[PDB]
Amino acid sequence: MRRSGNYNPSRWDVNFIQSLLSDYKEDKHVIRASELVTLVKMELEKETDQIRQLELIDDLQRMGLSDHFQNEFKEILSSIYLDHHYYKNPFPKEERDLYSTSLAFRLLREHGFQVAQEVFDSFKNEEGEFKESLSDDTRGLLQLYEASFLLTEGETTLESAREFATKFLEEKVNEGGVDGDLLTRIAYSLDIPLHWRIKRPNAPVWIEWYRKRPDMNPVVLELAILDLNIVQAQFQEELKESFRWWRNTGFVEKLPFARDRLVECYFWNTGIIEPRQHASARIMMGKVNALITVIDDIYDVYGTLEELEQFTDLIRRWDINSIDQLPDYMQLCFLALNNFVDDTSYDVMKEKGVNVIPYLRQSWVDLADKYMVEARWFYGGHKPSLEEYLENSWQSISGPCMLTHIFFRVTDSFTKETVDSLYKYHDLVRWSSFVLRLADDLGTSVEEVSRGDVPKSLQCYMSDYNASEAEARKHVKWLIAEVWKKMNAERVSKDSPFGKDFIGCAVDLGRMAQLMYHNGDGHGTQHPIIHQQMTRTLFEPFA
Amino acid sequence: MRRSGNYNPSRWDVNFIQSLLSDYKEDKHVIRASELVTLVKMELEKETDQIRQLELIDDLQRMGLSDHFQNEFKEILSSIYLDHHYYKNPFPKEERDLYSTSLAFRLLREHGFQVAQEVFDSFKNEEGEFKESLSDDTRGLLQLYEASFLLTEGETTLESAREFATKFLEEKVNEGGVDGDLLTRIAYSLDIPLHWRIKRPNAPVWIEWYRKRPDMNPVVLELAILDLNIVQAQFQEELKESFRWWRNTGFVEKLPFARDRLVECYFWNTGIIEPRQHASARIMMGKVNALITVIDDIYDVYGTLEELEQFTDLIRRWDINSIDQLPDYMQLCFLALNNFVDDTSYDVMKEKGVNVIPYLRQSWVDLADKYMVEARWFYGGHKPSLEEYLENSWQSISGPCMLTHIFFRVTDSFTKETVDSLYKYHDLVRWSSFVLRLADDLGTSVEEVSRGDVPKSLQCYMSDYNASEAEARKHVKWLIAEVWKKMNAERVSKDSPFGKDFIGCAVDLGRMAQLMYHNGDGHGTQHPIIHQQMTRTLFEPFA
Numbered sequence A, B: 001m002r003r004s005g006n007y008n009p010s011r012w013d014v015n016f017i018q019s020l021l022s023d024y025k026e027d028k029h030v031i032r033a034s035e036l037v038t039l040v041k042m043e044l045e046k047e048t049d050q051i052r053q054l055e056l057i058d059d060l061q062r063m064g065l066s067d068h069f070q071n072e073f074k075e076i077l078s079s080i081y082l083d084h085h086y087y088k089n090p091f092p093k094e095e096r097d098l099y100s101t102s103l104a105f106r107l108l109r110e111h112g113f114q115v116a117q118e119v120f121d122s123f124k125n126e127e128g129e130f131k132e133s134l135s136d137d138t139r140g141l142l143q144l145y146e147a148s149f150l151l152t153e154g155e156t157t158l159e160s161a162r163e164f165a166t167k168f169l170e171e172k173v174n175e176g177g178v179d180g181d182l183l184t185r186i187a188y189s190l191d192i193p194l195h196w197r198i199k200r201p202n203a204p205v206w207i208e209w210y211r212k213r214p215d216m217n218p219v220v221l222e223l224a225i226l227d228l229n230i231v232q233a234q235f236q237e238e239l240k241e242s243f244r245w246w247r248n249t250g251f252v253e254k255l256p257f258a259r260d261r262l263v264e265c266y267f268w269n270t271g272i273i274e275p276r277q278h279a280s281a282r283i284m285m286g287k288v289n290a291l292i293t294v295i296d297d298i299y300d301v302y303g304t305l306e307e308l309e310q311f312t313d314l315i316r317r318w319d320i321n322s323i324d325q326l327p328d329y330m331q332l333c334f335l336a337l338n339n340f341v342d343d344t345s346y347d348v349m350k351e352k353g354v355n356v357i358p359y360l361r362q363s364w365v366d367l368a369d370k371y372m373v374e375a376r377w378f379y380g381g382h383k384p385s386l387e388e389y390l391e392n393s394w395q396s397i398s399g400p401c402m403l404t405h406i407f408f409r410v411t412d413s414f415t416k417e418t419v420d421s422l423y424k425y426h427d428l429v430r431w432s433s434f435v436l437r438l439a440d441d442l443g444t445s446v447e448e449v450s451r452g453d454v455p456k457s458l459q460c461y462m463s464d465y466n467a468s469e470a471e472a473r474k475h476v477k478w479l480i481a482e483v484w485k486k487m488n489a490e491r492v493s494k495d496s497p498f499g500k501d502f503i504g505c506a507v508d509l510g511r512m513a514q515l516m517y518h519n520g521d522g523h524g525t526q527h528p529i530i531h532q533q534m535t536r537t538l539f540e541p542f543a
């Protein structure tokens, strides 16, 4: 008379999330940490090999040390750019290095630099195709395959650079390889390019690969390790706070049709918000992703059509008086939601001088609504086309909701315009959103539909063009490619109104969705080995 | 060009407040405690002498164990009640004993046994006046003086008994040789009768008095002291919590002007809610008393007349949309105030299954508006007549807000109907409110109005009858006298719709009120020794 997608219970118990009594939770560490930051800062500014700095830049970044070295990352690339005239689209053709040019291409464009597609030009035969000689330089080769991910629609060279590269990386790995760890790094990124590969939940493996590295420096290896632990401690801190909240809602028992995953739900933010200083944003998001998970279960599992429409609309008119009029589980949910935006908007009014409640409120509302059109089809047995779906999709998934919540806390000051521009669900918001969706849709879907939910994109795909599932998979993979391109531009600006740290969260959501839904089982639903990176980046300390 | 209270900061430090944490939170602790109940109970129930059985319920109470010995106290008095026949309309001749009759009359009436006034008749003489021959029995005379506080206009005999024992008790005290330290127990209740002595912030002394008591029982003394500590700890826990809330409002820095006295604001609740199990009622109440303190400041000190007519109103219409147009300091106060009722209400909705938000809201609205009426008399010339003031005061002293807020936490179940009876503001609520007030006015007054405010009773009485200050202080003391009677009556009442505990806190706020405002200003600022009382029932352990 009610359904329930049978999600099992959170593999992490209270007493654990409460025990979690860290260790590098105290200063002496960071003083030490912050004391190497300096040696490394200048082993950095001391080096002269530009390609070396590039190499060390890329490394510091794959290990989450990126927070210290920020304006260094900038002085260095600023320079290389200029002292290599990377600006000009018109090429000089020093035949340049494939490896050094791709590496620098990559970090420059990432660090927002204008670096013409035509840079890789001097590596083409006169047939205009890529140079089949290059076929052997695979350090470089692997690295060009890695700069491609930084393109935009209308950048064939890049688009075919990725093609050539993959094929050779491919074979090289396919045969016994001209190494062993090469064989793996090639596959590691042939599984996910660094550009779509989210840092923080991954630093560890890179940390020890650098450890096993020769050239390798310790001031580094070790600075890398300490900081690593200095934040983990901290995550744990934000962790409890969010838990502490979860527990109070007692949805855990009072509204349990709902998957419980406060941890998974806080773990996303471990990637979505990489700049350590935005803690409250991560805490607040532990709870926001949570309220989402529950409101979505209410929509695609539990609640009925009457029940939903009613909920939907009271939300719409944020009618806390009629609070008691909807079923009982929709009261406690609704009030906990009104309690969350109100306590959250208090902290923003409190610490930034602004009444943000009309917005986080909207954020919720729209999210609610779109979850509604998804019931309706499904309940009303309407099955939509790929576009109808893809259109609700990028919002029902909650991307803007979480992403708009995040803006008020990563950015330090905004104007009403910056704000309204955002709430268009500014393009940025829609593209990182699409990725989380397309990736999420590509992960779930089978069960989304099976234990109830409207068809997903692969699904509407295969009905649409009437295709094989593979066909849909490929299609939807492509879609992701395409919006990443869309996103690349936007993030590297549009005279984007969005500040630094914010847009990066936007980009990082699309990134974390790709880890989270890379082998499957939701943002935790049934957790494959998403359970490893999790206990590894949240609980288990480093060597 | 905004007045200021001329206030000092919480004498207690956050890092202290935050730290303090005591060893007795360790279970085995109360276990010991709970092995002694079993035997002090044992000693109790096995007692034979009924006058020793009463002297024990009385200590078990004043010493704080009143909680684990409940269903015992009942049997021992239903037994003395019935046996000694106190439920009869007559019986005397000239034969009961003074100390036992008074002692047993006090406990039975306290416990709501009906024990007619005429009992003390048997100690009267020819003229229908207390036999002077009694001028001697002082353990007796003291016992009587003290049971005269359990009367009800009706009761002249008790009113005329209050006199007897007081005069000769003064004698006995002016004579340093009647004993010496009894001379101090005598004057102790001569200052505040047991009937109007909140227990909890008073146990310590009783404890060591019982301790030096010759006849004393050490397992009692033992159970006694261990409990004191096991509950002072739970206080501290609650303390931190309501603190933790305080720190968040950030009123300290943002709504400076109002006094910061949160441990005081909690200490209050150390008397109002004596049954240990109401832990939340006391946490929630730390936060409530705080908002009251503040909102009160906002009215009698910072806020302007337009700025208050405004606050007053929006809260009355209660809406966080036009929250946008109050002064920034009134957006923060109104929003956090809303958040609290919303939070508190989510708790009651969580646990008790009901939406109490439209009532706590209403508690807050009426409190506000009475703060307004006074604010208009201030700004708007008017010096009310001693009765118009008295009719607003008992409401403007927060009183009902405090209590109504409380009813919901201490009452497992209820009915719209008894809620409503409550919310018209039952007499039960009114009388205790009254005590808190008059005790306040009697105490506060001075800087209250000199440093700007409306005339408190002391003052309207003087103006009114053009009287010296004694008279008015006397009148008020006499008034406290009367509402207390009206209070005995309602607490033992007929069909009070309130439960033991609740009606309990109603008379207990009047008691706590007579403590804080007994040495002047109490609450927070002057609190003379009022600090050694807190420092002692919140931080400083026993033996």
Ligand SMILES: C=C(F)[C@](C)(CCC=C(C)C)OP(=O)(O)OP(=O)(O)O
Pocket: A265, A268, A288, A289, A290, A292, A293, A296, A300, A396, A397, A398, A440, A444, A448, A453, A522, A523
């Ligand atoms: C509640 C959802 F939106 C999740 C669990 C993922 C997003 C929640 C985060 C980022 C904390 O996916 P789900 O598959 O349940 O959404 P769906 O109902 O659109 O399929």
Ligand SMILES: C=C(F)[C@](C)(CCC=C(C)C)OP(=O)(O)OP(=O)(O)O
Pocket: B265, B268, B289, B292, B293, B294, B296, B297, B300, B396, B397, B398, B440, B444, B448, B523
């Ligand atoms: C702190 C206040 F707000 C009080 C103590 C009144 C009520 C607060 C309590 C009971 C802890 O003092 P105040 O003298 O200003 O009361 P009044 O302004 O209503 O006369």
Ligand SMILES: [Mn+2]
Pocket: A296, A297, A300, A453
């Ligand atoms: Mn779902």
Ligand SMILES: [Mn+2]
Pocket: A296, A299, A300, A371, A374, A396, A453
């Ligand atoms: Mn859904």
Ligand SMILES: [Mn+2]
Pocket: A440, A441, A444, A445, A448
């Ligand atoms: Mn899904």
Ligand SMILES: [Mn+2]
Pocket: B296, B297, B300
């Ligand atoms: Mn005042």
Ligand SMILES: [Mn+2]
Pocket: B296, B299, B300, B371, B374
């Ligand atoms: Mn006042």
Ligand SMILES: [Mn+2]
Pocket: B440, B441, B444, B445, B448
């Ligand atoms: Mn006062």
